[PDB]
């Protein structure tokens, strides 16, 4: 079986599998981080994009489309989107896409229009409703301003080796695109076949792929893709214990032959509980000073848990009468989910929203990159006071690029960062008892991370081969027997013909012809 | 390799669905029902396999319970004690939740009726042993066996099931309805190739469009009776069947709106209202989509109703309660509509429940109760095939999708399955059967072995095919654990014989 | 720049050095005289290089490099014919079948098309290659002629894979796209393989039916099938309407619009039309209104 890995990220792993004659793309991960490099965008013009200055590159060439905030350069052009690569592997001939996690599953849409693919596409109902709804908040977002109209223009290799350290470090700098449209979007979710739990798909009369629970948020499929013989396991997203959604199938994972393990916590020191109590104390705190709190979160997962404790501290605090106003476009069908598996909603800012606006309030807004979306105009208006707090819930941004261009901030900025999935003493004692024979797990997983010296990192006796990048990696399985069923009525008499060597061993002569009928093996007599 | 399959209370009798299904080593109980009309002696479908063997557990692995009918799942609380079953039972998620709904009220007008019933407190000791199974998963309830549920329409919840133990699959398929009726669509089973395929007969007649013809036939008798103060009494035994209704009555508005008069199921129509809101994901694809960009099924009328309609002479809509009962609402309805020329009745069901259904048929004017009444009836009769079923040609239909090696029919009358039994044996290259109650069918099949080859043999086995004679030598090897194909010389190296 | 990405290629550590190499020179493009250039260069490295992961890439560089607008793939086509005689992995040689192909597009000139297309005739008998065989199927409809092509897919209509059976059905259709007339061998082969278990195939088989059936409405079926005889394009639109109602939400979508596309039906069978059976999902009612308009004006 060969194993091409075609995205860098731990988090979003869109890793490909050729085996048993049939090749499956694990999943479709849009990155994020080249968004947060490039300079923020505002719904409506903000004083401060207009009066920036260039970051004075010379050296020829350019000094249009790159600026500096703080001391770091940030790019002119519209926010473009890291990803996988598609080159080192035909998408054809990777037959079906199978999608995990409503988060995992963004850059879908990408490779369905532009770069050929011929296949269906299998996720549980309701990641591919989730999904669709927070592509459609994505696409919303940077297409309410069209300033996409600039060009990057600093991808040139002898640009990046001049230029200062924020931009330098660019893992790929040439596959960055400008996001798709809600055609493409819709495209793909056309493809998508809607697959309950524990149901046996099988493509092409080859393998049999199932969407296990995985215990994280509702719509976490965690897969496995057996044959008869070789069980090969797909664990992303798979949160221990999340309350609500159903827990993670450590039976059904069990005697794998070959498990990839991709999602996993993106802070090692997460300590969920203790983050989601501090949370609810610093929100307190400041709209008691009668300081306003901005919090920039997703429109799943994330968000409902944080919503439940804040009530409930409301209820033990007596805080009533602070408007906890989510704004965002699909906070409609968000609630809408929650109900089918006081808080007001708005959809559109500057309309209910405005006319319904009070002093203090606590405002869970469009996106947590910080460049695209309505956080950024929320995030001008209320830098400018002390009293204001930003609490950053979400781990998939690093606390300091936001930070960056809006360094000179007065708002006391306060990071909460909570994720559910697996720990790696989580992983450390899963991985004990479902037994698998080789492991195979991104490099970041391999060595401690870089900002702690101790040794949490995932290790496994049989000492697992990392990941990478572009790096097509085969692992040590031969296919050595393949079933073959016996007819009933010409074949199976003559043979039964067994003659005795051994009193456990038998013998007999089998004589027949084998039709190969869609993939499938069945010898009787001619 | 002989799989037993005996309707205790299906077969040549609809209601009191029950078929015990013998596949392989596996016993497996398919429903077991509480039959109306009759007072006793129908209140379980009487158990043979019960009487032979003194716990059930030990006698039978399993129990698959089709939906929340009383038909079906009405006489599961039956086994909580007295007969003392232990297992999983396996119903759908929706099933689940509505089935001890309809337990406890059928429970509710048998005490009013005295009766060794079971208490509120049994069928909860009955329902603390049940398992819920999604749609489209495979689960093992067994070592070897395992089921799977399906969409079969017909109501929420809905389970068309498929015991597999090996390469047999027997499915059964009890009240499936191949259109989408409203919160349903069409009953889906994939290309399985079962052996034993188990279907509903109750309609063995071939029927026009379920909505449309169902629409007209509605539009027109409403027409009729509104000319003199036009009543409408309607049975209606199931929560899907009072929307149903409800969404029949705002048709009628639409059309023609000229009497506001609209009444309601009952008292607790809230909790209906409820129930479909609740499962979004088992309605209709459409509809659910409809329903989060729409508002659902708004009723606010049964209140104003009751009190309109105690026994004065009005226009007032009234779908009753139980109607094919001993006593309720429903028969309270009927008495106070009985006698006059502004009453006309519709029966929306099968209207199928012994002696209640005998007098629906022969629609007799001078009508005897149970009781010592005298009630004679001057309103027009008309019974409308508005029921969620599978007609003749949609059984037709699923048997085609299926394409088993034979058919059985249960849950129909023998007269109507006889002639479905004619057809589908001309039709299809099948022989199926129409067993009465208590009777066997040892349809015989024989079993099919499977064995794993060496992949080098079949790949040259495979080249040799293609080019053209295709003969294909080799022993197997038979420890009993692992029966594997080997090559001659393999088997000869290793076993060690040169 | 030539010589310089020649010594490049060589001087890699380990395989998979090479491997990205060649990946971020795939992102750089290439005029007229260096793809002659490079083309030489990858192809010797192919030659040398031990690992299947380095050679895909080679071979997709090399379609790549023939697809170039300057470039005319001449005197390397008969170099890339060389290698696909002593390859040996399924996966990289269907690569360079599709190369292949590309390379056939590319100049439409009678004589090498030829070579090609036997050439993908000997890779088309491959065993046990799903891959192999559909690339070829693929690469004979592209580059095939206007019989004997035609005749050879039926061949793989009979195959193992529904993956195989599909790429036949869509070839056949892609020969009649370009001009050519399919037989009515074609016809029954195609009413032989409408009710196959897979959907992909059922889609296309359909299409397929309806092609030959716009094809041969005239023509007439002799074989009675339980009754007289009837037209061929009668029979047609009765196996599309039947499709209708199978069981499937897209093999429907097929029918639909083929079905409505259908012309000089017997006026008969065109009134007794089960299109009335439009029900469940949406998209599928929808869509079977907008012929029906179309041809009640016929």
Same mark, same amino acid.
């Given at each position: 079986?060969?194993?091409?890995?075609?995205?860098?990220?731990?988090?979003?792993?869109?890793?490909?599998?050729?085996?048993?004659?049939?090749?499956?793309?694990?999943?479709?991960?849009?990155?994020?981080?080249?968004?947060?490099?490039?300079?923020?965008?505002?719904?409506?013009?903000?004083?401060?994009?207009?009066?920036?200055?260039?970051?004075? $590159?010379?050296?020829?060439?350019?000094?249009?489309?790159?600026?500096?905030?703080?001391?770091?350069?940030?790019?002119?052009?519209?926010?473009?989107?890291?990803?996988?690569?598609?080159?080192?592997?035909?998408?054809?001939?990777?037959?079906?896409?199978?999608?995990?996690?409503?988060?995992?599953?963004?850059?879908?849409?990408?490779?369905?229009?532009?770069?050929?693919?011929?296949?269906?596409?299998?996720?549980?109902?309701?990641?591919?409703?989730?999904?669709?709804?927070?592509?459609?908040?994505?696409?919303?977002?940077?297409?309410?301003?069209?300033?996409?109209?600039?060009?990057?223009?600093?991808?040139?290799?002898?640009?990046?080796?001049? $230029?200062?350290?924020?931009?330098?470090?660019?893992?790929?700098?040439?596959?960055?695109?400008?996001?798709?449209?809600?055609?493409?979007?819709?495209?793909?979710?056309?493809?998508?076949?809607?697959?309950?739990?524990?149901?046996?798909?099988?493509?092409?009369?080859?393998?049999?792929?199932?969407?296990?629970?995985?215990?994280?948020?509702?719509?976490?499929?965690?897969?496995?893709?057996?044959?008869? /013989?070789?069980?090969?396991?797909?664990?992303?997203?798979?949160?221990?214990?999340?309350?609500?959604?159903?827990?993670?199938?450590?039976?059904?994972?069990?005697?794998?032959?070959?498990?990839?393990?991709?999602?996993?916590?993106?802070?090692?020191?997460?300590?969920?509980?203790?983050?989601?109590?501090?949370?609810?104390?610093?929100?307190?705190?400041?709209?008691?000073?009668?300081?306003?709190?901005?919090?920039?979160?997703?429109?799943?997962?994330?968000?409902?848990?944080?919503?439940?404790?804040?009530?409930?501290?409301?209820?033990?605090?007596?805080?009533?009468?602070?408007?906890?106003?989510?704004?965002?476009?699909?906070?409609?069908?968000?609630?809408?989910?929650?109900?089918?598996?006081?808080?007001?909603? /708005?959809?559109?800012?500057?309309?209910?929203?405005?006319?319904?606006?009070?002093?203090?309030?606590?405002?869970?807004?469009?996106?947590?990159?910080?460049?695209?979306?309505?956080?950024?105009?929320?995030?001008?208006?209320?830098?400018?006071?002390?009293?204001?707090?930003?609490?950053?819930?979400?781990?998939?941004?690093?606390?300091?690029?936001?930070?960056?261009?809006?360094?000179?901030?007065?708002?006391?900025?306060?990071?909460?960062?909570?994720?559910?999935?697996?720990?790696?003493?989580?992983?450390?004692?899963?991985?004990?008892?479902?037994?698998?024979?080789?492991?195979?797990?991104?490099?970041?997983?391999?060595?401690?991370?870089?900002?702690?010296?101790?040794?949490?990192?995932?290790?496994?006796?049989?000492?697992?081969?990392?990941?990478? /990048?572009?790096?097509?990696?085969?692992?040590?399985?031969?296919?050595?027997?393949? /079933?073959?069923?016996?007819?009933?009525?010409?074949?199976?008499?003559?043979?039964?013909?067994?003659?005795?060597?051994?009193?456990?061993?038998?013998?007999?002569?089998?004589?027949?012809?084998?039709?190969?009928?869609?993939?499938?093996?069945?010898?009787?007599?001619? | 390799?002989?799989?037993?399959?005996?309707?205790?209370?299906?077969?040549?009798?609809?209601?009191?669905?029950?078929?015990?299904?013998?596949?392989?080593?596996?016993?497996?109980?398919?429903?077991?029902?509480?039959?109306?009309?009759?007072?006793?002696?129908?209140?379980?479908?009487?158990?043979?396999?019960?009487?032979?063997?003194?716990?059930?557990?030990?006698?039978?692995?399993?129990?698959?319970?089709?939906?929340?009918?009383?038909?079906?799942?009405?006489?599961?609380?039956?086994?909580?004690?007295?007969?003392?079953?232990?297992?999983?039972?396996?119903?759908?998620?929706?099933?689940?939740?509505?089935?001890?709904?309809?337990?406890?009220?059928?429970?509710?007008?048998?005490?009013?009726?005295?009766?060794?019933?079971?208490?509120?407190?049994?069928?909860?000791?009955?329902?603390?042993?049940?398992?819920?199974?999604?749609?489209?998963?495979?689960?093992?309830?067994?070592?070897?066996?395992?089921?799977?549920?399906?969409?079969?329409?017909?109501?929420?919840?809905?389970?068309?099931?498929?015991?597999?133990?090996?390469?047999?699959?027997?499915?059964?398929?009890?009240?499936?309805?191949?259109?989408?009726?409203?919160?349903?669509?069409?009953?889906?089973?994939?290309?399985?190739?079962?052996?034993?395929?188990?279907?509903?007969?109750?309609?063995?007649?071939?029927?026009?469009?379920?909505?449309?013809?169902?629409?007209?036939?509605?539009?027109?008798?409403?027409?009729?009776?509104?000319?003199?103060?036009?009543?409408?009494?309607?049975?209606?035994?199931?929560?899907?069947?009072?929307?149903?209704?409800?969404?029949?009555?705002?048709?009628?508005?639409?059309?023609?709106?000229?009497?506001?008069?609209?009444?309601?199921?009952?008292?607790?129509?809230?909790?209906?209202?409820?129930?479909?809101?609740?499962?979004?994901?088992?309605?209709?694809?459409?509809?659910?989509?409809?329903?989060?960009?729409?508002?659902?099924?708004?009723?606010?009328?049964?209140?104003?109703?009751?009190?309109?309609?105690?026994?004065?002479?009005?226009?007032?809509?009234?779908?009753?309660?139980?109607?094919?009962?001993?006593?309720?609402?429903?028969?309270?309805?009927?008495?106070?509509?009985? %006698?006059?020329?502004?009453?006309?009745?519709?029966?929306? %069901?099968?209207?199928?429940?012994?002696?209640?259904?005998?007098?629906?048929?022969?629609?007799?004017?001078?009508?005897?109760?149970?009781?010592?009444?005298?009630?004679?009836?001057?309103?027009?009769?008309?019974?409308?095939?508005?029921?969620?079923?599978?007609?003749?040609?949609?059984?037709?239909?699923?048997?085609?999708?299926?394409?088993?090696?034979?058919?059985?029919?249960?849950?129909?009358?023998?007269?109507?399955?006889?002639?479905?039994?004619?057809?589908?044996?001309?039709?299809?290259?099948?022989?199926?059967?129409?067993?009465?109650?208590?009777?066997?069918?040892?349809?015989?099949?024989?079993?099919?072995?499977?064995?794993?080859?060496?992949?080098?043999?079949?790949?040259?086995?495979?080249?040799?095919?293609?080019?053209?004679?295709?003969?294909?030598?080799?022993?197997?090897?038979?420890?009993?654990?692992?029966?594997?194909?080997?090559?001659?010389?393999?088997?000869?190296?290793?076993? %060690?014989?040169? | 720049?030539?010589?310089?990405?020649?010594?490049?290629?060589?001087?890699?550590?380990?395989?998979?050095?090479?491997?990205?190499?060649?990946?971020?020179?795939?992102?750089?493009?290439?005029?007229?005289?260096?793809?002659?250039?490079?083309?030489?260069?990858?192809?010797?490295?192919?030659?040398?290089?031990?690992?299947?992961?380095?050679?895909?890439?080679?071979?997709?560089?090399?379609?790549?490099?023939?697809?170039?607008?300057?470039?005319?793939?001449?005197?390397?086509?008969?170099?890339?014919?060389?290698?696909?005689?002593?390859?040996?992995?399924?996966?990289?040689?269907?690569?360079?079948?599709?190369?292949?192909?590309?390379?056939?597009?590319?100049?439409?000139?009678?004589?090498?098309?030829?070579?090609?297309?036997?050439?993908?005739?000997?890779?088309?008998?491959?065993?046990?290659?799903?891959?192999?065989?559909?690339?070829?199927?693929?690469?004979?409809?592209?580059?095939?002629?206007?019989?004997?092509?035609?005749?050879?897919?039926?061949?793989?209509?009979?195959?193992?894979?529904?993956?195989?059976?599909?790429?036949?059905?869509?070839?056949?259709?892609?020969?009649?796209?370009?001009?050519?007339?399919?037989?009515?061998?074609?016809?029954?082969?195609?009413?032989?393989?409408?009710?196959?278990?897979?959907?992909?195939?059922?889609?296309?088989?359909?299409?397929?039916?309806?092609?030959?059936?716009?094809?041969?409405?005239?023509?007439?079926?002799?074989?009675?099938?339980?009754?007289?005889?009837?037209?061929?394009?009668?029979?047609?639109?009765?196996?599309?309407?039947?499709?209708?109602?199978?069981?499937?939400?897209?093999?429907?979508?097929?029918?639909?619009?083929?079905?409505?596309?259908?012309?000089?039906?017997?006026?008969?069978?065109?009134?007794?039309?089960?299109?009335?059976?439009?029900?469940?999902?949406?998209?599928?009612?929808?869509?079977?209104?907008?012929?029906?308009?179309?041809?009640?004006?016929?």
């Amino acid at each position: 079986m060969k194993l091409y890995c075609l995205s860098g990220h731990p988090t979003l792993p869109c890793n490909v599998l050729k085996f048993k004659s049939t090749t499956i793309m694990l999943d479709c991960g849009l990155d994020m981080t080249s968004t947060l490099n490039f300079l923020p965008l505002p719904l409506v013009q903000s004083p401060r994009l207009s009066n920036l200055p260039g970051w004075s $590159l010379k050296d020829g060439n350019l000094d249009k489309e790159l600026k500096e905030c703080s001391g770091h350069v940030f790019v002119d052009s519209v926010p473009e989107f890291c990803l996988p690569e598609t080159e080192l592997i035909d998408l054809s001939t990777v037959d079906v896409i199978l999608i995990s996690n409503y988060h995992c599953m963004m850059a879908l849409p990408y490779i369905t229009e532009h770069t050929g693919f011929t296949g269906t596409v299998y996720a549980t109902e309701p990641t591919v409703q989730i999904g669709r709804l927070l592509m459609e908040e994505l696409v919303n977002f940077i297409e309410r301003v069209p300033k996409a109209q600039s060009a990057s223009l600093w991808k040139n290799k002898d640009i990046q080796r001049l $230029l200062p350290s924020p931009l330098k470090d660019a893992v790929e700098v040439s596959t960055w695109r400008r996001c798709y449209t809600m055609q493409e979007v819709n495209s793909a979710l056309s493809k998508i076949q809607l697959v309950g739990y524990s149901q046996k798909i099988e493509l092409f009369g080859a393998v049999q792929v199932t969407p296990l629970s995985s215990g994280y948020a509702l719509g976490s499929s965690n897969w496995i893709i057996q044959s008869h /013989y070789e069980k090969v396991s797909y664990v992303s997203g798979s949160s221990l214990l999340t309350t609500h959604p159903q827990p993670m199938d450590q039976a059904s994972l069990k005697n794998s032959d070959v498990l990839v393990l991709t999602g996993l916590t993106q802070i090692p020191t997460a300590n969920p509980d203790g983050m989601v109590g501090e949370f609810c104390s610093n929100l307190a705190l400041t709209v008691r000073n009668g300081g306003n709190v901005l919090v920039p979160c997703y429109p799943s997962g994330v968000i409902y848990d944080l919503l439940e404790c804040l009530y409930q501290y409301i209820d033990s605090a007596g805080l009533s009468s602070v408007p906890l106003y989510f704004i965002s476009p699909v906070a409609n069908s968000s609630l809408e989910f929650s109900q089918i598996f006081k808080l007001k909603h /708005y959809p559109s800012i500057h309309g209910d929203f405005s006319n319904d606006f009070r002093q203090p309030c606590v405002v869970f807004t469009g996106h947590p990159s910080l460049r695209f979306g309505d956080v950024v105009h929320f995030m001008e208006l209320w830098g400018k006071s002390s009293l204001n707090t930003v609490i950053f819930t979400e781990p998939d941004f690093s606390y300091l690029e936001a930070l960056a261009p809006y360094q000179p901030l007065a708002m006391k900025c306060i990071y909460c960062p909570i994720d559910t999935r697996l720990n790696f003493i989580q992983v450390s004692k899963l991985l004990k008892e479902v037994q698998p024979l080789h492991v195979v797990c991104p490099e970041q997983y391999t060595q401690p991370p870089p900002a702690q010296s101790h040794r949490m990192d995932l290790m496994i006796d049989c000492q697992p081969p990392a990941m990478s /990048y572009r790096r097509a990696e085969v692992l040590a399985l031969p296919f050595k027997r393949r /079933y073959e069923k016996i007819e009933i009525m010409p074949e199976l008499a003559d043979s039964l013909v067994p003659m005795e060597i051994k009193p456990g061993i038998s013998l007999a002569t089998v004589s027949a012809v084998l039709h190969t009928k869609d993939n499938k093996h069945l010898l009787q007599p001619p | 390799p002989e799989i037993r399959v005996t309707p205790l209370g299906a077969g040549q009798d609809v209601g009191r669905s029950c078929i015990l299904v013998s596949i392989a080593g596996k016993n497996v109980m398919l429903d077991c029902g509480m039959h109306m009309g009759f007072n006793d002696d129908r209140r379980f479908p009487d158990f043979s396999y019960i009487t032979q063997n003194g716990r059930l557990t030990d006698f039978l692995d399993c129990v698959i319970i089709s939906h929340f009918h009383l038909d079906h799942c009405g006489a599961l609380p039956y086994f909580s004690e007295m007969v003392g079953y232990d297992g999983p039972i396996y119903m759908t998620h929706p099933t689940q939740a509505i089935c001890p709904i309809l337990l406890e009220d059928y429970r509710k007008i048998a005490v009013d009726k005295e009766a060794n019933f079971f208490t509120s407190q049994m069928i909860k000791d009955c329902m603390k042993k049940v398992v819920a199974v999604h749609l489209h998963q495979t689960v093992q309830v067994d070592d070897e066996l395992e089921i799977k549920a399906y969409y079969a329409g017909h109501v929420l919840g809905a389970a068309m099931f498929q015991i597999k133990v090996g390469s047999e699959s027997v499915v059964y398929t009890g009240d499936y309805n191949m259109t989408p009726d409203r919160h349903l669509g069409a009953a889906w089973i994939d290309k399985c190739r079962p052996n034993l395929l188990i279907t509903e007969s109750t309609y063995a007649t071939t029927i026009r469009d379920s909505k449309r013809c169902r629409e007209r036939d509605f539009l027109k008798k409403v027409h009729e009776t509104v000319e003199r103060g036009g009543k409408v009494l309607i049975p209606v035994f199931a929560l899907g069947r009072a929307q149903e209704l409800c969404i029949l009555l705002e048709t009628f508005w639409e059309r023609m709106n000229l009497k506001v008069p609209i009444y309601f199921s009952t008292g607790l129509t809230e909790k209906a209202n409820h129930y479909y809101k609740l499962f979004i994901p088992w309605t209709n694809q459409k509809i659910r989509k409809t329903f989060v960009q729409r508002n659902m099924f708004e009723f606010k009328h049964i209140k104003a109703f009751d009190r309109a309609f105690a026994d004065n002479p009005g226009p007032m809509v009234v779908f009753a309660t139980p109607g094919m009962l001993h006593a309720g609402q429903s028969l309270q309805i009927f008495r106070k509509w009985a %006698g006059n020329e502004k009453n006309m009745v519709i029966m929306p %069901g099968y209207c199928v429940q012994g002696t209640v259904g005998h007098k629906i048929l022969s629609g007799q004017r001078k009508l005897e109760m149970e009781g010592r009444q005298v009630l004679e009836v001057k309103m027009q009769v008309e019974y409308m095939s508005f029921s969620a079923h599978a007609d003749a040609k949609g059984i037709m239909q699923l048997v085609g999708q299926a394409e088993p090696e034979s058919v059985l029919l249960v849950h129909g009358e023998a007269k109507k399955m006889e002639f479905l039994k004619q057809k589908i044996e001309q039709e299809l290259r099948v022989n199926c059967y129409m067993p009465a109650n208590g009777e066997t069918v040892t349809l015989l099949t024989s079993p099919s072995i499977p064995v794993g080859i060496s992949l080098g043999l079949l790949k040259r086995e495979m080249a040799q095919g293609l080019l053209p004679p295709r003969l294909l030598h080799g022993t197997l090897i038979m420890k009993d654990s692992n029966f594997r194909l080997v090559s001659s010389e393999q088997a000869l190296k290793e076993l %060690g014989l040169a | 720049k030539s010589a310089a990405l020649h010594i490049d290629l060589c001087k890699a550590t380990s395989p998979a050095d090479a491997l990205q190499y060649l990946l971020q020179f795939a992102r750089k493009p290439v005029e007229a005289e260096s793809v002659e250039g490079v083309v030489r260069i990858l192809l010797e490295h192919y030659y040398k290089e031990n690992d299947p992961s380095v050679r895909l890439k080679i071979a997709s560089l090399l379609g790549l490099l023939s697809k170039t607008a300057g470039f005319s793939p001449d005197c390397i086509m008969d170099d890339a014919i060389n290698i696909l005689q002593n390859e040996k992995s399924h996966q990289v040689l269907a690569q360079l079948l599709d190369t292949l192909l590309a390379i056939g597009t590319k100049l439409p000139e009678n004589q090498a098309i030829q070579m090609r297309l036997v050439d993908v005739a000997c890779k088309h008998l491959t065993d046990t290659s799903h891959g192999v065989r559909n690339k070829c199927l693929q690469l004979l409809g592209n580059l095939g002629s206007l019989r004997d092509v035609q005749k050879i897919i039926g061949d793989y209509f009979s195959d193992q894979d529904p993956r195989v059976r599909t790429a036949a059905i869509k070839a056949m259709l892609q020969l009649h796209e370009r001009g050519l007339k399919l037989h009515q061998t074609i016809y029954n082969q195609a009413c032989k393989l409408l009710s196959d278990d897979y959907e992909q195939v059922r889609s296309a088989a359909v299409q397929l039916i309806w092609v030959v059936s716009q094809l041969y409405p005239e023509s007439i079926v002799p074989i009675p099938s339980s009754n007289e005889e009837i037209r061929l394009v009668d029979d047609a639109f009765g196996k599309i309407c039947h499709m209708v109602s199978d069981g499937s939400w897209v093999v429907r979508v097929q029918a639909a619009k083929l079905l409505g596309s259908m012309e000089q039906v017997s006026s008969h069978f065109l009134e007794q039309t089960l299109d009335k059976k439009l029900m469940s999902d949406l998209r599928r009612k929808r869509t079977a209104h907008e012929r029906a308009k179309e041809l009640y004006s016929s």
